[PDB]
Design a protein around this nucleic acid. Structure first.
Ligand code: FES
Ligand SMILES: [K+]
Ligand SMILES: [K+]
Ligand SMILES: [K+]
Ligand SMILES: [K+]
Ligand SMILES: [K+]
Ligand SMILES: [K+]
Ligand SMILES: [K+]
Ligand SMILES: [K+]
Ligand SMILES: [K+]
Ligand SMILES: [K+]
Ligand SMILES: [K+]
Ligand SMILES: [K+]
Ligand SMILES: [K+]
Ligand SMILES: [K+]
Ligand SMILES: [K+]
Ligand SMILES: [Mg+2]
Ligand SMILES: [Mg+2]
Ligand SMILES: [Mg+2]
Ligand SMILES: [Mg+2]
Ligand SMILES: [Mg+2]
Ligand SMILES: [Mg+2]
Ligand SMILES: [Mg+2]
Ligand SMILES: [Mg+2]
Ligand SMILES: [Mg+2]
Ligand SMILES: [Mg+2]
Ligand SMILES: [Mg+2]
Ligand SMILES: [Mg+2]
Ligand SMILES: [Mg+2]
Ligand SMILES: [Mg+2]
Ligand SMILES: [Mg+2]
Ligand SMILES: [Mg+2]
Ligand SMILES: [Mg+2]
Ligand SMILES: [Mg+2]
Ligand SMILES: [Mg+2]
Ligand SMILES: [Mg+2]
Ligand SMILES: [Mg+2]
Ligand SMILES: [Mg+2]
Ligand SMILES: [Mg+2]
Ligand SMILES: [Mg+2]
Ligand SMILES: [Mg+2]
Ligand SMILES: [Mg+2]
Ligand SMILES: [Mg+2]
Ligand SMILES: [Mg+2]
Ligand SMILES: [Mg+2]
Ligand SMILES: [Mg+2]
Ligand SMILES: [Mg+2]
Ligand SMILES: [Mg+2]
Ligand SMILES: [Mg+2]
Ligand SMILES: [Mg+2]
Ligand SMILES: [Mg+2]
Ligand SMILES: [Mg+2]
Ligand SMILES: [Mg+2]
Ligand SMILES: [Mg+2]
Ligand SMILES: [Mg+2]
Ligand SMILES: [Mg+2]
Ligand SMILES: [Mg+2]
Ligand SMILES: [Mg+2]
Ligand SMILES: [Mg+2]
Ligand SMILES: [Mg+2]
Ligand SMILES: [Mg+2]
Ligand SMILES: [Mg+2]
Ligand SMILES: [Mg+2]
Ligand SMILES: [Mg+2]
Ligand SMILES: [Mg+2]
Ligand SMILES: [Mg+2]
Ligand SMILES: [Mg+2]
Ligand SMILES: [Mg+2]
Lengths: 112, 108, 168, 71
RNA sequence: AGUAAACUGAGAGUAGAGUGCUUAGUUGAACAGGGCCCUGAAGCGCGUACACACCGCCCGUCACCCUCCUCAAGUAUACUUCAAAGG
RNA sequence: AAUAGGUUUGGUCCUAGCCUUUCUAUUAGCUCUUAGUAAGAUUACACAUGCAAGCAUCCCCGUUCCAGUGAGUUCACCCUCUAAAUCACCACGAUCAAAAGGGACAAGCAUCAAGCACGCAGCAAUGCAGCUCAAAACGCUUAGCCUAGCCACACCCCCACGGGAAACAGCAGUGAUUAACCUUUAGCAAUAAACGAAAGUUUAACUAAGCUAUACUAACCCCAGGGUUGGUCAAUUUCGUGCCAGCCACCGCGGUCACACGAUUAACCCAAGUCAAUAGAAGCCGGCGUAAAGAGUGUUUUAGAUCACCCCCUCCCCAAUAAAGCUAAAACUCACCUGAGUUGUAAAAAACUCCAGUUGACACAAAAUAGACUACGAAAGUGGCUUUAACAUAUCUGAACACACAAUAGCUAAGACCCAAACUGGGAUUAGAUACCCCACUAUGCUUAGCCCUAAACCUCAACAGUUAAAUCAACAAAACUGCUCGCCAGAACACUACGAGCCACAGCUUAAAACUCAAAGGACCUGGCGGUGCUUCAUAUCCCUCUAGAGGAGCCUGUUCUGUAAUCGAUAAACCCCGAUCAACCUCACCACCUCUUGCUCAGCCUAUAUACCGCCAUCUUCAGCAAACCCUGAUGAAGGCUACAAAGUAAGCGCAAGUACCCACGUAAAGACGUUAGGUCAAGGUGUAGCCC
C-alpha cells in the first residue's frame, strides 16, 4: 500500500490561534466535546496564542486545514500567502460565532 | 599537459559542493505526515520504522526513526539530522530522539 | 618531475638571483636575437636563462623579443628621457651580457643597500600592534609590566568590580 | 577485452531509438511549438534593438524573416 | 568364461515365519571385429562475462511501491528592465 | 591531499572513487564546581517603551563624526592634476584628501559567441566606418573585501525634487522567522569626540558591570560525566533476543553458543565536558595501446618551438585522384537441334517445366591469376586496359570560432538492370520461429545531379626531432624512453540522454549537463571449473554397430509413493525403493486409545530437537592415482609455477596405487583403495556436545 495515503473527504483539520491562552483552552475544550467522529473527523493540527503566522499557513497547507483566529489579526502578507496556498483564514471575535462557523465547515464535509 | 596548456586552462575549478538532504544545515525542523516501515535492501531483512515529514523548507522527505520503539504520529514536530540509513535506499535523514515531540527511547 | 628543460628557471629562488635592477630611466628593453648561428649563442642563452630574472627584478619594464629580424643579435634600451642605448651582443656570452647591462644601466650595490635600509624604518621595534605589523601586540608582553588579565588575574583592588562595591 | 561496456551502450541506444519511434508524432508537435517560440524569441531580440536606439518602428522597409521554417 | 543362462543344495536369523539375503556345487554358451559418427577418458591445445564453479551466469518486455528528473495545453502569480531619455 | 589506513576479486596486480585517522567552528543529545579573560540574533523581516547631540553671552560650530549592518558590489590600491580641511592670519609650502584623467583589481558558466554604435579625424562645418571579442567581448549566476583596516548601504523606487509610505542594519528590548535566541545595567572617573577663551558641559562612543561551557588561562578537602569496546582503531564478562527487535563513518553484524543488537559487568579514550549532525581546512608539473582520454582527415592567423642555417644518401617508378573511351572470363536474353525433367540440402517441401544440356549471338553489372608483391593517397579509400590532366609546403607545431574532404547505409530527381538483396510472400523447422535453412521478389548496391556527414572512420598507439644510454620493465599487447607542441582525459551509472544553439539534416547529426542512485565500476592476470571446444589415441561388458538372457505387458510375492487410519521412525538421482530388517501375529515397539506409577532397573530416566555440533561405521567419484611434511629454485621475491634422458631446477621422508597376503598358480576373483568431493547416510546400534522434558 502507498506509504502516503489520501486523507478522506470527511476530515476537517483546524488551526486554532487566539489572543490569550485562556481563550485558546476554551476553544480546545469545545473541540474535545466532538462526538460525531463517525460521520466526520475533527483534527487539531496546531494551536497557539498570537496573530496568524506563516507557520500556521504552512501547517494548514500541509494538512489542508482551516485556520480559525479568535480575537487575532492576519496581515496582508499572511492573507495573500494564504490565497496562493489555498488556505482559509477565518478570523472571529465571538466564541459562539467561531463555533457556528466550525459547525458549518463540518457540515460541508458530511455526505449528502 | 604542457605548461602552455596548464597556463591556458588555469587552476583546476572545483565544482560547488553538493548540498545534502539538509541543504548544508546541521538540523531541520519537520512536521510528521505519516509513519510506516521500509524494508532494507539485500542481504538485510527487517521492518525499519520510518516517517514522511515536511521540512521547514517545504520539502517532504523520508526520515528514519532510530531506537527500539517510537510513538510519533501525524501533525507532530520533529528535528531531523543528516546521516544516511545504509540499507534503506534513498533514506538520508534521521529523526533526533529526545527533541520536540520525539522522546528518548524507553530503557529496556 | 617539473616539466621542461632546466626547470630551475621556474623557481622563486632562481628568479631572485638576478643582479640587474635597472635605473628608473629604463622603460623598455627590446631583445633582437637569432635562433641559429654560433655567434648568436649568448643571446639565445640570455633570453633562455636571464630574461626571466631581469623581468622578475624589473616588473614594470617592458621586455619585448624579436626573432631573426636582423643579421646579428643586439639589445636596445629605451629611457624615459627619450635616449636609446644600443648594446651589441654578438660573440658575447650570456654572463657577459648580464654583466654589461648591469654596469651601464643597473643600480650599484650601494644604491640598493640604501633602499633596503629605508624600508626598515617602516617597522619600528617600539611600536605595538598586530603581529603582521609589529613585534608585540601589547605592553603586557614586556616582562616587569602588569601582565594581561587573561593570564594573571589582577588584584581585587585594581578591578572596577570591587572598586565600585567598596565605594558604593 | 570483453564487450560489456559496448553492450550497455547498445541497449541504451536500442531503447532510445525505439522510444523515439513510439512517440514520433508527439515529438513532432512539440518540435513545431518550440520552433514557433524560437521565432518569436528572435523577433523580440530584434525589436529590442531598434526600440533601445530611440526608433519607434522597425527600419523603413525591414521585415523580420522566418529563419527557422523548413522552407 | 567355467562367465552369462538354466538347475540343485546349504547356512545365517525365529518358538514359528521370506518368491529375501549369504554361500557351495552341477550343466554350460554366443559375440569379442570393426568405428570415432554417438557418449566419455587420457595427452596436448583453444576459449571463457563461470569461481558452493554450466543445475554457472545473464538481457529485455510486462505490476505494486519508493526517489528524482524532463516535456507540456491553457491560465495565473511574482520578479526583472525603462529616465543611462526627450521637449 | 599525509609517515598514511580501510574497502572492488575465488585470488593477484594495476587504476580508481568513497570513507577512516588530524585540526577548527556552528547546532542537537546527555552532562556541568569556582575564578579571570575573550567572544557572543538565524534573518537588509516588522518593531511597543526608554535612552543614544549638544555646546555656547544670543552668531556660528556640531548633530556630515562615532555607533550599525553586509543588501548591493571590481567607487578600496598606484600615478597625474587639483578643490575643501589642519598649521591663528598669507603659508607664497608642507600635511591630509575629494571630483576628474590614466593604469591595476573576485569566483562559476562558452549550452552566455558574437556585442550592436560599442570608433577616429577636424577650430568648426562635417568627413571616414570604424570599436570590443575564443589571449573570452557581451551576458547570466554567486559573494562584502586584499582585515592596524577598507568598501558599500542607511525602509523601498540604484539616486530621492517627487512618490510609496511612516522606517531601531544606534544601545537595551520585542514579534515573526531559523537547527541558531546576551541586560529593557551603571557611569561620564579614564581615553576619544563635539562645543567653549576657559573653569567646564554632553556623549547607549567608550569605560566598569550583567547573562551564556563558544574558547583560552588557573585552581579546587568534598564533587565526572559523554562516547566507545568486530576490523580500520585504544578497550567486554554474564544474560536476553533468534535475519525478529535493532546496529553501522567504511567494510559489515543479527536466521538458537552474537567479543558488532538490548541490558548488565568490566575496560578504553577524552574530560567540565563529551561528540551526533553540518560546514570548512588538507587536491593542476598525473595521464591518454587495453583502466577516463591522440578528438575520422588535412590545411591558417596571432603565436609557440629549437627539431630552421650551414649539411647532406630513395629524386622517380608499383593498387592516389578526375575525365573520356575500351573488354577478357562468367551471367542474362533470344534462335536451331535434342532431353523430361530442372532447382533445392543433414533431409525435405515449395518453386520452375516458354525447363534443362550443346552451340552461336550477347552489358550503363562486377574486375580470376599476377599479389609469397606491400605500393599510392590527408584520411576515407585505391589491385581489368588505354590515354589525358595530375599528386601542397627549401624550418616544425597549429583552427571544435573557419574551409575542403570523409566507407557503408540513407534521402530527393531522372535513367540502367546481369546478379545479389533489407522488407515482404510462400516452403520447411519449432512448444512458439516475427529467426537460423529453401524459393520468389522489391527498396538498395550502378550512372547523372544534389543532399545526409555517420563507422570497432581502430594499426583504439597524435605531429616533428632524437636515443638504445641506462634506474629496461606493474600485467598484457606491438621493447623502453628524451625534447617540443597541439588535442584530449579526471569513480561508476544516469548519458551516443535532457535542454540550448547550429545544420538542405524533421524517427536526423554535432556540441552536451544535472537531480535521484551506488561503493564500487574498470583494466590485465593466476588457478580451477566448464565448453552443443580443436587435434591425436582410445574405451573391451563396452561409447557406437554388434552377442546372450532379461525388465517394461499377465498373475502373484515384496518395497516405495499416494490415499486412508485414533495409530511410528529412518532411507528416498547416480549413491533410496526384499533399504536399517541375516526379517513386525503378542513380544519385538519406538506408534494409537484408555488406565496406572513418581528419587522411579540405575549416585534416575528420555527412540525429545539438532547427522547443519560430532565420535563410531559407511556410501560416492574409486571400473580413480594421486595427496602431503620439509627444503630448493623460477616468476623483478604477485596470485602461482617447477618437464625435455643426446635432459633445460628440482630433491623429497610419509600416505595411496604397486608389491605382498587369502582362495586352486605367477592367472583370476577377492581383499585393499590415500587426500578430498556431495554440511551425502545414520543422534532410532552405542556414545556424545548444545537446547529442551522432570506429576
Ligand atoms: S593583551 Fe595586553 S593586557 Fe591583554
Ligand atoms: K545480514
Ligand atoms: K584507495
Ligand atoms: K558653539
Ligand atoms: K554584501
Ligand atoms: K539603497
Ligand atoms: K569622560
Ligand atoms: K566496532
Ligand atoms: K569517433
Ligand atoms: K580481373
Ligand atoms: K582496429
Ligand atoms: K582452463
Ligand atoms: K517385474
Ligand atoms: K559423518
Ligand atoms: K546416537
Ligand atoms: K544428542
Ligand atoms: Mg547515523
Ligand atoms: Mg576473446
Ligand atoms: Mg541502460
Ligand atoms: Mg544453463
Ligand atoms: Mg573490479
Ligand atoms: Mg564606523
Ligand atoms: Mg546574507
Ligand atoms: Mg585650499
Ligand atoms: Mg577620485
Ligand atoms: Mg543546456
Ligand atoms: Mg549578498
Ligand atoms: Mg529596519
Ligand atoms: Mg536610498
Ligand atoms: Mg538593536
Ligand atoms: Mg523572539
Ligand atoms: Mg549561538
Ligand atoms: Mg577647543
Ligand atoms: Mg546614560
Ligand atoms: Mg562586558
Ligand atoms: Mg553542547
Ligand atoms: Mg545469546
Ligand atoms: Mg551491543
Ligand atoms: Mg579507454
Ligand atoms: Mg587518428
Ligand atoms: Mg514439388
Ligand atoms: Mg601545419
Ligand atoms: Mg582538426
Ligand atoms: Mg559519406
Ligand atoms: Mg546512394
Ligand atoms: Mg535474383
Ligand atoms: Mg516466412
Ligand atoms: Mg532492383
Ligand atoms: Mg560500373
Ligand atoms: Mg578503416
Ligand atoms: Mg580514437
Ligand atoms: Mg596534431
Ligand atoms: Mg551514434
Ligand atoms: Mg542527440
Ligand atoms: Mg534539441
Ligand atoms: Mg552394458
Ligand atoms: Mg510387470
Ligand atoms: Mg514408509
Ligand atoms: Mg524422511
Ligand atoms: Mg535425513
Ligand atoms: Mg502391547
Ligand atoms: Mg505389535
Ligand atoms: Mg518415548
Ligand atoms: Mg553429514
Ligand atoms: Mg595376484
Ligand atoms: Mg571389493
Ligand atoms: Mg593393493
Ligand atoms: Mg545433510
Amino acid at each position: 500500500p502507498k506509504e502516503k495515503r489520501e486523507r478522506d473527504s470527511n476530515v476537517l483539520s483546524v488551526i486554532i490561534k487566539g489572543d490569550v491562552d485562556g481563550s485558546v483552552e476554551a476553544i480546545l475544550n469545545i473541540i474535545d466535546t466532538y462526538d460525531a467522529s463517525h460521520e466526520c473527523e475533527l483534527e487539531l493540527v496546531h494551536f497557539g496564542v498570537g496573530d496568524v503566522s506563516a507557520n500556521d499557513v504552512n501547517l494548514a497547507e500541509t494538512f489542508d486545514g482551516v485556520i480559525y483566529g479568535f480575537n487575532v489579526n492576519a496581515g496582508n502578507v499572511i492573507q495573500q500567502s494564504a490565497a496562493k496556498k489555498g488556505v482559509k483564514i477565518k478570523l472571529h471575535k465571538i466564541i459562539y460565532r467561531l463555533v457556528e462557523d466550525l459547525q458549518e465547515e463540518l457540515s460541508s464535509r458530511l455526505p449528502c | 599537459a604542457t605548461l602552455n596548456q596548464m597556463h591556458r586552462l588555469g587552476p583546476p575549478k572545483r565544482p560547488p559542493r553538493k548540498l545534502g538532504p539538509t541543504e548544508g544545515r546541521p538540523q531541520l525542523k519537520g512536521v510528521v505526515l505519516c509513519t510506516f516501515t521500509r524494508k532494507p535492501k539485500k542481504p538485510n531483512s527487517a521492518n525499519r520504522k520510518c516517517c514522511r515529514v515536511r521540512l521547514s523548507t517545504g520539502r517532504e522527505a523520508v526520515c528514519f526513526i532510530p531506537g527500539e520503539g517510537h510513538t510519533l504520529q501525524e501533525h507532530q514536530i520533529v528535528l531531523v539530522e543528516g546521516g544516511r540509513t545504509q540499507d534503506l535506499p534513498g533514506v538520508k535523514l534521521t529523526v533526533v530522539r529526545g527533541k520536540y515531540d520525539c522522546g528518548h527511547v524507553q530503557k529496556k | 618531475p617539473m616539466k621542461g628543460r632546466f626547470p630551475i628557471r621556474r623557481t622563486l629562488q632562481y628568479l631572485s638571483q638576478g643582479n640587474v635592477v635597472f635605473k628608473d630611466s629604463v622603460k623598455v628593453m627590446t631583445v633582437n636575437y637569432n635562433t641559429h648561428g654560433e655567434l648568436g649563442e649568448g643571446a639565445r642563452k640570455f633570453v633562455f636563462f636571464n630574461i626571466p630574472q631581469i623581468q622578475y627584478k624589473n616588473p614594470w619594464v617592458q621586455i619585448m623579443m624579436f626573432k631573426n629580424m636582423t643579421p646579428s643579435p643586439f639589445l636596445r634600451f629605451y629611457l624615459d628621457s627619450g635616449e636609446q642605448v644600443l648594446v651589441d651582443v654578438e660573440t658575447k656570452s650570456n654572463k657577459e651580457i648580464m654583466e654589461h647591462i648591469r654596469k651601464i644601466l643597473g643600480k650599484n650595490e650601494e644604491t640598493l643597500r640604501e633602499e633596503e635600509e629605508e624600508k626598515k624604518q617602516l617597522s619600528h621595534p617600539a611600536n605595538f600592534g598586530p603581529r603582521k605589523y609589529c613585534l608585540r601586540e601589547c605592553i603586557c608582553e614586556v616582562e616587569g609590566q602588569v601582565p594581561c588579565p587573561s593570564l594573571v588575574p589582577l588584584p581585587k583592588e585594581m578591578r572596577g568590580k570591587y572598586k565600585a562595591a567598596l565605594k558604593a | 577485452k570483453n564487450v560489456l561496456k559496448i553492450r550497455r551502450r547498445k541497449m541504451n541506444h536500442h531503447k532510445y531509438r525505439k522510444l523515439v519511434k513510439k512517440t514520433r508524432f508527439l515529438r513532432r508537435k512539440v518540435q513545431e511549438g518550440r520552433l514557433r517560440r524560437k521565432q518569436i524569441k528572435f523577433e523580440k531580440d530584434l525589436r529590442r534593438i531598434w526600440l533601445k536606439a530611440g526608433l519607434k518602428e522597425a527600419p523603413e522597409g525591414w521585415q523580420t524573416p522566418k529563419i527557422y521554417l523548413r522552407g
